[PDB]
Amino acid sequence: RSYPCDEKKQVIAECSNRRLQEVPQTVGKYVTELDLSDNFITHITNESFQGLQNLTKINLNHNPNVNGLNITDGAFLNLKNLRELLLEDNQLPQIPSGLPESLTELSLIQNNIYNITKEGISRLINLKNLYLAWNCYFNKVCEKTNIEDGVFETLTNLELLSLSFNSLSHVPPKLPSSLRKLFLSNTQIKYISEEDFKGLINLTLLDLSGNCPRCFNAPFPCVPCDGGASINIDRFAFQNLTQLRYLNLSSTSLRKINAAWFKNMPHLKVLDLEFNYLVGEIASGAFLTMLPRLEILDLSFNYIKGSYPQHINISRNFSKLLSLRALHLRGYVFQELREDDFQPLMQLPNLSTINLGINFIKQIDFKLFQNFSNLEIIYLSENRISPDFEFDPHSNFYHFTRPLIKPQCAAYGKALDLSLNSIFFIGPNQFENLPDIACLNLSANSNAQVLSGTEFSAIPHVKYLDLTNNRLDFDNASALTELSDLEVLDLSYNSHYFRIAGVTHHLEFIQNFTNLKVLNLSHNNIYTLTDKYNLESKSLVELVFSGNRLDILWNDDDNRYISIFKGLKNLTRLDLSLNRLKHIPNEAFLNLPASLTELHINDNMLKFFNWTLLQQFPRLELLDLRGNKLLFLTDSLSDFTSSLRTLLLSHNRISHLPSGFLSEVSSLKHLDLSSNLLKTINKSALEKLSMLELHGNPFECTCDIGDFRRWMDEHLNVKIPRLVDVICASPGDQRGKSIVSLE
Amino acid sequence: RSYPCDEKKVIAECSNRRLQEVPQTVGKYVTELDLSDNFITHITNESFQGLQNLTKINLNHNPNVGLNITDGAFLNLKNLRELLLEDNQLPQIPSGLPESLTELSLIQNNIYNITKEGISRLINLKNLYLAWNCYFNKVCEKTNIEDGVFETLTNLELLSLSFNSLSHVPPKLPSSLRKLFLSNTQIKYISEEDFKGLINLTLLDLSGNCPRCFNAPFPCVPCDGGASINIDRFAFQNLTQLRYLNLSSTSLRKINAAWFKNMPHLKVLDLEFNYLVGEIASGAFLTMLPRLEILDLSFNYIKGSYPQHINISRNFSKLLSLRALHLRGYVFQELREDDFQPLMQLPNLSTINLGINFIKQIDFKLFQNFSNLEIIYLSENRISPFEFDPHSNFYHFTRPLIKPQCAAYGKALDLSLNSIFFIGPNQFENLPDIACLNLSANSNAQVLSGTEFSAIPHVKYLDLTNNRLDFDNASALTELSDLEVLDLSYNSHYFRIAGVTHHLEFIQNFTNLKVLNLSHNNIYTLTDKYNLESKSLVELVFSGNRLDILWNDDDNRYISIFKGLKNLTRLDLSLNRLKHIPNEAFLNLPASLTELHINDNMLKFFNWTLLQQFPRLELLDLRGNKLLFLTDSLSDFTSSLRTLLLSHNRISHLPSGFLSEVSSLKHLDLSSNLLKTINKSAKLSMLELHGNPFECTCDIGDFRRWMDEHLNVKIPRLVDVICASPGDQRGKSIVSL
Ligand SMILES: Nc1nc2c(ncn2[C@@H]2O[C@H](COP(=O)(O)O[C@H]3[C@@H](O)[C@H](n4ccc(=O)[nH]c4=O)O[C@@H]3COP(=O)(O)O)[C@H]3OP(=O)(O)O[C@H]32)c(=O)[nH]1
Ligand SMILES: Nc1nc2c(ncn2[C@@H]2O[C@H](COP(=O)(O)O[C@H]3[C@@H](O)[C@H](n4ccc(=O)[nH]c4=O)O[C@@H]3COP(=O)(O)O)[C@H]3OP(=O)(O)O[C@H]32)c(=O)[nH]1
Ligand SMILES: *[C@@H]1O[C@H](CO)[C@@H](O[C@@H]2O[C@H](CO)[C@@H](O[C@@H]3O[C@H](CO)[C@@H](O)[C@H](O)[C@@H]3O)[C@H](O)[C@H]2NC(C)=O)[C@H](O)[C@H]1NC(C)=O
Ligand SMILES: *[C@@H]1O[C@H](CO)[C@@H](O[C@@H]2O[C@H](CO)[C@@H](O[C@@H]3O[C@H](CO)[C@@H](O)[C@H](O)[C@@H]3O)[C@H](O)[C@H]2NC(C)=O)[C@H](O)[C@H]1NC(C)=O
Ligand SMILES: *[C@@H]1O[C@H](CO)[C@@H](O[C@@H]2O[C@H](CO)[C@@H](O[C@@H]3O[C@H](CO)[C@@H](O)[C@H](O)[C@@H]3O)[C@H](O)[C@H]2NC(C)=O)[C@H](O)[C@H]1NC(C)=O
Ligand SMILES: *[C@@H]1O[C@H](CO)[C@@H](O[C@@H]2O[C@H](CO)[C@@H](O[C@@H]3O[C@H](CO)[C@@H](O)[C@H](O)[C@@H]3O)[C@H](O)[C@H]2NC(C)=O)[C@H](O)[C@H]1NC(C)=O
Ligand SMILES: *[C@@H]1O[C@H](CO)[C@@H](O[C@@H]2O[C@H](CO)[C@@H](O)[C@H](O)[C@H]2NC(C)=O)[C@H](O)[C@H]1NC(C)=O
Ligand SMILES: *[C@@H]1O[C@H](CO)[C@@H](O[C@@H]2O[C@H](CO)[C@@H](O)[C@H](O)[C@H]2NC(C)=O)[C@H](O)[C@H]1NC(C)=O
Ligand SMILES: O=c1ccn([C@@H]2O[C@H](CO)[C@@H](O)[C@H]2O)c(=O)[nH]1
Ligand SMILES: O=c1ccn([C@@H]2O[C@H](CO)[C@@H](O)[C@H]2O)c(=O)[nH]1
Ligand SMILES: *[C@@H]1O[C@H](CO)[C@@H](O)[C@H](O)[C@H]1NC(C)=O
Ligand SMILES: *[C@@H]1O[C@H](CO)[C@@H](O)[C@H](O)[C@H]1NC(C)=O
Ligand SMILES: *[C@@H]1O[C@H](CO)[C@@H](O)[C@H](O)[C@H]1NC(C)=O
Ligand SMILES: *[C@@H]1O[C@H](CO)[C@@H](O)[C@H](O)[C@H]1NC(C)=O
Ligand SMILES: *[C@@H]1O[C@H](CO)[C@@H](O)[C@H](O)[C@H]1NC(C)=O
Ligand SMILES: *[C@@H]1O[C@H](CO)[C@@H](O)[C@H](O)[C@H]1NC(C)=O
Ligand SMILES: *[C@@H]1O[C@H](CO)[C@@H](O)[C@H](O)[C@H]1NC(C)=O
Ligand SMILES: *[C@@H]1O[C@H](CO)[C@@H](O)[C@H](O)[C@H]1NC(C)=O
Ligand SMILES: *[C@@H]1O[C@H](CO)[C@@H](O)[C@H](O)[C@H]1NC(C)=O
Ligand SMILES: *[C@@H]1O[C@H](CO)[C@@H](O)[C@H](O)[C@H]1NC(C)=O
């Protein structure tokens, strides 16, 4: 049984974030990939891996976690098959000397390396990917980056070079022509000469973002080119970049795009022009002629500060972008979207996504979207429609790359996102002349209206409706029923009226949906309903009821809600967490749908749980009771269940395991007992279980512990994670140490 | 040193201490004993034997999480006046309670039988509480009141019987009564005989008898066919001294004016939760109330009905003494000027409350034409551009409608929890001279520009919390020259977004601004001006923001973010995720500070030597962090520090000399840390140590010795200052060795 790492085959040794002080000498001979990131390793020497000649990869990132990792000349030199070596965030002062010449990936992102030397690098002929980003940047106290002449020239298999967020001042000379991707973002390069990318006939990606940056409102310390000038790109800079697919020129202070940049660039797929000053160019846009194969165009945050124009001015020459799939125009900042303003786009055959987030737009003429060929995502979030390093070095710096629309919503069809606006009620004609919308997000519009069964009549086929973070007033039982096809409904965070005991709350409308599969009512603080105390639906499969007040609903002095979930005949998944529950009336538990396969009651305050009532739940596979105050287990659990696969009891107050509880239920694969109060496990508990969790428990590590230890050896198919977290509370000398390490 | 209680001046506070039974170590000299919320299971004549000067006993909520009392167990207690036995699941009144009893509370038990044997022996009772013994869907018997049981109680002033099944006003009540409480007692009928003889009654509560049950937040049984309570027209005839009358939720559709004939001093009339819409618009009984100060007609809405207007009878103009009119939940669309006519000449009408009416429009000019409103309460409308506490009102909350700190300044207008998502140019035309304005929770997303409040320029307290304000203009709120308190908490919406502007410059422009709250805005980036500046400002709350990011190691722009706050005495930096504070950032905090909070962050280290630049610093709060050790040189860094809070850190060892370092140091909190000892080595008035894991061997004795030799050093919760080790000491307070 491996220690300290968790070893598997897919041979990986997961060994991260385990407070290891030195490289463990206890790693299998057979491991090919070792991860020791986020540990406290302070030294590496020609000893540190002596056992492990079959190592293809070592991750040593972020050591030591909260001064600097200390690597000896040739410490890795003995590792003949070492391919990928990650050394990020290790406060290195130089590139380690004597690296094995077999390397293909080297990463030194986020260290203190300001000298890139032949001695360090030139001998590594097999390097494919080399990452030196983020060594000198912002107001980090650091030197200008010295790149020794010809250091890269010998790297003739190098496909990816990244030097971003270093002070370079000039594109380094003598780059090998093997290069496919070249990242030089935020490098302080003012000027790009015809010579800089001369040879690079294989380049597919070039990133010159952040050189001559647009600094207004920068969320980082930002230094403009003198006068706020744009980057200066020679007319012929890109001449031989025939294979370029991706070009990032975000925040280079462009007022003018040169069309001839693109003359020899027939395969260009992505042009990123965020954070420039391109309002003028968006109105003119000759360069657009040059880009009929472009799929993605990001023109976000090019606004003129202070200027809030009536309309957006889009060149007719947008019509020429025949391959365009997505257009991003956040942050142009304009008051009104009129049908004609988007004419140049209405015939683009493959234009699927339009993103106008964050434009402070007050009005939109929605009939305009109809006229589009093929829109699948209309993203209008964040407008004014009405009735220890801050930046991840492995992320895009200029936007977020999460999907615009949850995938679960977009699978249903056309998507319209009106989240984070001011649509505080939906009027009669609000959704008029819209397309057949299937996925609709109205989250956080502070919508306080009484829905009544007509508001979505124009878009009756909505299948996924996100109404979270509003303040909806449920005083009408026809609400939403115009949506016969509704499958998913998200009503989380509409507490506003639910908190007020004296106003009606009608949730009757739920029964009227033929196809409703998932319903989210979390964080609504539900403690009182009007007239009908029961949730009913023949359809519903999942109910999420976390963060309401079942403590008040199932209070011992009130019977009204004793069956609140019973009418949910089709239910398999129920979540009752964060309901302040101290106990559940037996009658109320036995009234939970008998169809349940998955029940969560975690993060309440349960002192007692009545295990026997499980008998009314033949199909129950998973039971989550984490984060309650549970004191003991039943000793005959298999009397009460034959289905239970996963039982979670982390973070309770269990001090004893009953007689043979390990082998109590055959069906139990996964049992979680971590962060409880076990000081041992007697032979008593001995007499299909894949995983058993035990970390956090205060173990008494005397010879009383030997029974279980023996058990661990006799059942190595029972996985016990985090063995370094399965710790002796006592005795004094054994305190801190893993139970697994003492004789 | 008292144990296990904390004795004061002579009051033994001994509640919530996990006591299995009454402690036998109670100071013999104690008057009041609090043992509420322990796990006590039995009381005998043995329990309180040694204590004879007992005025009062509290044993509520025992055992907490079945209180057996023996007959006559309290008999030996010759001076016992007050006895609290709430929430003990008693099956009967206990027998043999002493005669000296002036106050008995038996709220929340299982007592269904009120007996002479229990009660009639208690000649001296002023106050008797028997409420909440059988109610709702509790399994309980109808309540038996033995005939005449209260007859002998001729000093009885308060009798509370609410929330029990009575069905009739028990007969034969001592005429001493000032206050009779009979809410939710299932009494359909009030006869002429029921009160007749109670000539000193100032208060009568008949609420919840024949309840209005629609949308009730509790299991609710109406009288047959929604019928009203039946009150005999001479039922209140000899109730000449009545000041408070509660008829909430009695299903009244009609009020008999003549109930108020002999009652010309009624001050409070509660008519919540009935059906008095017609009565409100006709209302002869409004003539019979010339001294009435507070009238509550809330929640008399007709369900479904949502009328254009509110119909207020002319006769409201006879309510000459009216100070506060509560008209929640009438439910209607539009408040016109003509509709509040009757109200305009009432000289003392200071408070008008229309919360929760779903109102869409108001003619704000109508409030001018009143004689002297101090409080216009319009929260929770549609304006645009055991569950229950047995010591609270059942039908409304009793907290001030407007926070006292805001009302203190003058006329107040509360428009919270509406949909005023921007303030238009006339939103505040025709208003009185408002001094306190609440616009919280309106989802207002506007760019304030220094003109929106011109029509009410003397606002001194402005609550704009829970909005989504867009700070894109340095002149925001600058028309309010008199502004003293500005609360902008919970306006994260746009501060989240790196790409839009965030202009806080406007703050320097106020001569008289004292308090600024910017909590929970997740502020991490600001536009152009990176500094907060004010000559006047005295307190800044900045909790719930991102100083971890503002003060990041690779950015210098915010290193002086608070320096320009030259007059500042209180600064809150809690909940900012700070793992460490740059030294140059700390030194840049205003030197005027007297109080600094940096609790609930994640600090591993603290540069104590930095305290030399803060010579007026009295309170330093570092609770809920990850500090691993204290300086050993504190005397050298500060001579001003009185309170030092380190609760909930990871401190393992107390530095030699620490306990006698500092002269200014009154109060030191080290509860919930990792102290195993306080070795001999290590103005002091209080020292908190509960929650630490002490080694309870002989090493500990030097500290015990220390405790004895300094009784002037309070150490609360000694019950909770527990041993972790060794195995035979685990569990035991460190005094009990
Ligand atoms: N460019 C951009 N993208 C944003 C923005 N806000 C959200 N996003 C989303 O990032 C996601 C990643 O976009 P990004 O353009 O940064 O990177 C793309 C594009 O550069 C590129 N791509 C993607 C699609 C395509 O048709 N052609 C193409 O070249 O492949 C990357 C991987 O993204 P994937 O599409 O596989 O998730 C997109 O998923 P999205 O359709 O929901 O809108 C995108 C934003 O402001 N700008
Ligand atoms: N009656 C009533 N009061 C409500 C309601 N909602 C909030 N409140 C507030 O609770 C508070 C308590 O009022 P309530 O009528 O329940 O009880 C009063 C009144 O019954 C009575 N009183 C108060 C003032 C007075 O002039 N005359 C008078 O008889 O003494 C009690 C204590 O008041 P306090 O000392 O807390 O101000 C008031 O302080 P408030 O001015 O903000 O408006 C009140 C509500 O819906 N109804
Ligand atoms: C400028 O524009 C280009 C957009 O083409 C950006 O390149 C993209 O950079 C991200 C972040 O490093 C890369 O994503 C990462 O990819 C690796 C490898 O597959 C994976 O380990 C990470 O988790 C993450 O997915 C992405 O590959 C890359 N795009 C392409 C086509 O290679 C560039 O980041 C932009 N520059 C800045 C500063 O925003
Ligand atoms: C309201 O509850 C719904 C339903 O539970 C939440 O949406 C669901 O969120 C879960 C994860 O939180 C999604 O499951 C995940 O699927 C992904 C991708 O396939 C998988 O990688 C994850 O391990 C996980 O299984 C689930 O698909 C999603 N369901 C739907 C229908 O969208 C929702 O987040 C809740 N709303 C709020 C505001 O919290
Ligand atoms: C019916 O209306 C009357 C209006 O007076 C309400 O009477 C009030 O009842 C509350 C609830 O206990 C009393 O509050 C208590 O005041 C005493 C003062 O010594 C204090 O010790 C308690 O902690 C508690 O705060 C309040 O005094 C009382 N008002 C008067 C003038 O006595 C009554 O509660 C209403 N009934 C229901 C069921 O809501
Ligand atoms: C925004 O910050 C202000 C200033 O901290 C908060 O208002 C202040 O709230 C405290 C209590 O948290 C008040 O002090 C308390 O006063 C009461 C009554 O005098 C007293 O009983 C307490 O012992 C304590 O002294 C303080 O007066 C009050 N300040 C003002 C100017 O009203 C405010 O609550 C914060 N807002 C939010 C939404 O968190
Ligand atoms: C509806 O719009 C809201 C608001 O933008 C989306 O909420 C975001 O969701 C992502 C992923 O769930 C989170 O990481 C963000 O934190 C959320 N933002 C906020 C402000 O809450 C929501 O996901 C959208 N719904 C769908 C179905 O796409
Ligand atoms: C402004 O309006 C809101 C209306 O809710 C008040 O916020 C409430 O404050 C009370 C008293 O502190 C709290 O107990 C409530 O929980 C708060 N409710 C909400 C929804 O936040 C606020 O106090 C009012 N401000 C002033 C100055 O009176
Ligand atoms: O927007 C509105 C308008 C009126 N009502 C009415 O107010 C009462 C209490 O909520 C109910 O009868 C309901 O009809 C609402 O709930 N919401
Ligand atoms: O409501 C608005 C309208 C426009 N802008 C403008 O948008 C840009 C980014 O915030 C800035 O120039 C600002 O003037 C806003 O910030 N908020
Ligand atoms: C790191 O360790 C090496 C030897 O292992 C030593 O020569 C060197 O001085 C150390 N450097 C630091 C800064 O610890
Ligand atoms: C673009 O849309 C056309 C139809 O207008 C379709 O034939 C073609 O397959 C689409 N192109 C891609 C790459 O999806
Ligand atoms: C629901 O609202 C509609 C629209 O006004 C109305 O016709 C209907 O009567 C309402 N139904 C209920 C349950 O009140
Ligand atoms: C909703 O379903 C119920 C049947 O349970 C029915 O009474 C009602 O008319 C339905 N309303 C709509 C709009 O489908
Ligand atoms: C029950 O749930 C299943 C999904 O597992 C679904 O196919 C079916 O429609 C549901 N039953 C009814 C009556 O809707
Ligand atoms: C109004 O209040 C004042 C001051 O408390 C009081 O003296 C006066 O009698 C009241 N006026 C009336 C008409 O009740
Ligand atoms: C703030 O907005 C007002 C109103 O639009 C305008 O007059 C003023 O110039 C603005 N001030 C700033 C700081 O831009
Ligand atoms: C606020 O004060 C600053 C300088 O202290 C000044 O620049 C600005 O014009 C002032 N604004 C207003 C609206 O008074
Ligand atoms: C500083 O605060 C104190 C107390 O509020 C006050 O006396 C003084 O006016 C303030 N100073 C200035 C310059 O506003
Ligand atoms: C504390 O700050 C002072 C002043 O900057 C500095 O001299 C000292 O080194 C700091 N000490 C620690 C513990 O960092």
Swiss-Prot record, chain B:
What is the membrane topology noted in the UniProt record heading this document? Single-pass type I membrane protein
| One of the GO biological process terms | positive regulation of interleukin-1 beta production
Q: For the LRRCT domain, which residue ranges apply?
A: 692-737
Listed GO CC annotations? endolysosome membrane; endoplasmic reticulum membrane; endosome membrane; external side of plasma membrane; Golgi membrane; plasma membrane
Q: Where are the annotated LRR repeats, by residue?
A: 79-100, 101-121, 124-146, 155-176, 177-197, 200-221, 241-262, 265-287, 291-313, 321-342, 348-369, 372-385, 409-430, 433-454, 458-478, 482-504, 512-533, 536-557, 567-588, 592-612, 616-637, 640-661, 664-682
* PTM comment text: Ubiquitinated by RNF216; leading to degradation by the proteasome.
Q: Which residues are glycosylated?
A: 45, 53, 68, 113, 200, 238, 246, 311, 315, 348, 369, 438, 473, 509, 517, 567, 607, 679
Give the record's disease field.
Immunodeficiency 98 with autoinflammation, X-linked: An X-linked disorder characterized by onset of recurrent infections associated with lymphoproliferation and autoinflammation in the first decade of life. Mostly males are affected; carrier females may have mild symptoms. Features include mouth ulcers, fever, poor early growth, hepatosplenomegaly, lymphadenopathy, polyarthritis, and non-infectious enteritis.
Biological function: Endosomal receptor that plays a key role in innate and adaptive immunity. Controls host immune response against pathogens through recognition of RNA degradation products specific to microorganisms that are initially processed by RNASET2. Recognizes GU-rich single-stranded RNA (GU-rich RNA) derived from SARS-CoV-2, SARS-CoV-1 and HIV-1 viruses. Upon binding to agonists, undergoes dimerization that brings TIR domains from the two molecules into direct contact, leading to the recruitment of TIR-containing downstream adapter MYD88 through homotypic interaction.
Subunit note: Homodimer. Interacts with MYD88 via their respective TIR domains. Interacts with UNC93B1. Interacts with BTK. Interacts with SMPDL3B.
Per its record, how is this protein called by name? Answer: Toll-like receptor 8
The shown chain, on whole-protein numbering, covers 32 to 817 of 1041
